[PDB]
Amino acid sequence: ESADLRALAKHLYDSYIKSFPLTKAKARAILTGKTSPFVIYDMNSLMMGEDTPLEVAIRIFQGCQFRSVEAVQEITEYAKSIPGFVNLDLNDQVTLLKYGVHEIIYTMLASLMNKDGVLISEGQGFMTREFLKSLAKPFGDFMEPKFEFAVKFNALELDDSDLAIFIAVIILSGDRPGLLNVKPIEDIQDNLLQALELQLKLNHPESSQLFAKLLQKMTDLRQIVTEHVQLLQVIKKTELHPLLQEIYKDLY
Amino acid sequence: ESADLRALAKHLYDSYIKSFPLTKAKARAILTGKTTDKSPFVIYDMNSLMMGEDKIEVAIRIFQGCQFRSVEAVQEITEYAKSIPGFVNLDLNDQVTLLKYGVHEIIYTMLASLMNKDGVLISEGQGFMTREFLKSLAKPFGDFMEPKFEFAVKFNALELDDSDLAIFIAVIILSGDRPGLLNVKPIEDIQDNLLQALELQLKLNHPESSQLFAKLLQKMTDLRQIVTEHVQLLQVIHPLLQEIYKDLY
Ligand SMILES: CN(CCOc1ccc(C[C@@H]2SC(=O)NC2=O)cc1)c1ccccn1
Ligand SMILES: CN(CCOc1ccc(C[C@@H]2SC(=O)NC2=O)cc1)c1ccccn1
């Protein structure tokens, strides 16, 4: 029943707004001429951006690291709002979060991104892509895939109410390793995919196959995480915040 | 025909899953360190014993507690047997003579899935009672569990999984040497077919393991020796079990 699906969509959108403060609409308002944040483009501009003696990439890197730990509490709160979720084997509840969190972190980071760079700290600042492309040797290309994805993903032109269902669809995947009770998982996701599809048909009629195109984005998204951990295997060789270790262990 | 035996194996595996909630793939998950969020309560002595009631003579409180899942295990076993191709079509009392003598042999086989060196999972994998704690009980219950642990340690070295276990369960059911059997020919017909399927299954799942088939059929001796030694030990001291101990041997 379609109205049951629309009700599903509104519940996720409402919950989404409560869990996540820097929504895409806000961020796109900031990024456009419709509100102002300090721009970091080289690093003369970086440390006038502190308002320091004497490596910058590591507290950028660990800066990134702790928005990850802020985002995890939000996502987890969000997930609790997905109908059928808390009612799952708590062992699958953490497998789902374990393999869902970075895919969502990167989906939502594209919202705070355009082709020049990325909104940082609740919209306070804006660091550029070419500046991130110019960081210290083991780093300096850790953002570039996120950016490549951000442009392709933002071309779909999703808004927050699309993104709320899509985020849920990611969490309830029936292909996570460690998934014991699968049938309840695929049962909810199949319902979320119907809601999404309907939500795509109403909100973007001009877009042919937008559903399809979006599901496909899931492959670049997975590829972001997979490449980032094999990047993470170059930093503790050659040359990280607790909560992350546990997520990264036994992760393919 | 090879592919049919495979097909027979799947039918058995799927019914095994359905009829048995506490499986070995999950039971081991608990027992290893792979369930990194929900873990069972340990009962390793007296003070840990009862502080547990809020989480899961005391000779009896464990004793009957066995019997009721033993009497509960009976349903899902008996339930299982009716998915075994050509079982319902058997004789309707060699059907029950078969269930009669094998029920325990099976429960003891599936008890080993929930066992390791230290103790045994209980109540839907919510508790875990140590073997030493069992050998230290009142009465002569004090060694009511020990042969079964002895069995498990040996049986688990065979390293069997559920899809292996599903088939072996059926091989036990359709014996061909219960006493109460008259229409025996059609049962040794089905077991002939189950054994082919087991043997082919074991070739595929365990190449590395030499004569795993024969080693596995041999475990059947110790297996019924357990049920045997068991009610020699139930003379020294529920309704449904009593029917079942009916001069069993
Ligand atoms: C340029 N930007 C935006 C990038 O913001 C993020 C980039 C990557 C992540 C994923 C983290 S980083 C890691 O190793 N693991 C993770 O989960 C999370 C956020 C900055 C820069 C400084 C401070 C905060 N933001
Ligand atoms: C240590 N464990 C696992 C043993 O679980 C069982 C042990 C024996 C049986 C066979 C029963 S006992 C008897 O005399 N006759 C029977 O048919 C059935 C189950 C506990 C401990 C407490 C409660 C339940 N389990």
Work out the number of β strands of chain A. 3
Based on the structure given, which CATH architecture of chain A is correct? Orthogonal Bundle
Q: What is the fourth-level CATH superfamily of chain A?
A: Retinoid X Receptor
Query: What helical percentage do the residues of chain A reach?
Result: 55-70%
Q: How many discrete structural domains of chain A?
A: 1
Give the bound compounds: the ligand CN(CCOc1ccc(C[C@@H]2SC(=O)NC2=O)cc1)c1ccccn1
The strand line-up of the biggest sheet of chain A is 1-3-2
The greatest interface between two protein chains, and residues involved on each side, is: A-B, 6 and 7 residues
Largest sheet of chain A: 3 strands, mixed
* Helix/strand order of chain A, N-terminal first: HHEHHHEEHHHHHH
| CATH hierarchy, class of chain A | Mainly Alpha
Q: Assess the beta-strand content of chain A as a share of residues.
A: under 5%
According to CATH, what is the topology of chain A?
Retinoid X Receptor
- Decide which structural class fits the backbone of chain A: mainly alpha
Number of helices of chain A: 11
Spatial extent as radius of gyration of chain A: 19 Å
As an assembly, this protein is homodimer
Morphology of chain A? globular
How would you characterize the overall build of this protein?
The structure is a homodimer. With 252 residues, chain A is mostly helical. Chain A has a single domain (1-252), classed as Retinoid X Receptor, CATH 1.10.565.10. Helix content of chain A is 62%, strand content 4%. The first copy, chain A, is built from 11 helices and 3 strands. The first copy, chain A, has helices at 2-19, 24-31, 44-47, 56-80, 90-109, 129-132, 144-154, 160-171, 182-203, 210-235, 242-248; strands at 38-40, 117-120, 125-128. Chain A has a 3-stranded mixed beta sheet with strand order 1-3-2. In chain A, α1 (2-19) crosses α4, α5 runs antiparallel to α8 and α5 packs across α10. The radius of gyration of chain A is 19 Å and the shape is globular. At the A-B interface, α5 of A face loops of B. The structure holds the ligand CN(CCOc1ccc(C[C@@H]2SC(=O)NC2=O)cc1)c1ccccn1 (2 copies). The site of one copy of the ligand CN(CCOc1ccc(C[C@@H]2SC(=O)NC2=O)cc1)c1ccccn1 has 14 residues of chain B, from α4 and β2. It is classed as transcription/transcription inhibitor. The entry lists the keywords small four-stranded beta-sheet, Transcription Factor, RXRalpha, TRANSCRIPTION-TRANSCRIPTION inhibitor complex. The assembly is dimeric.
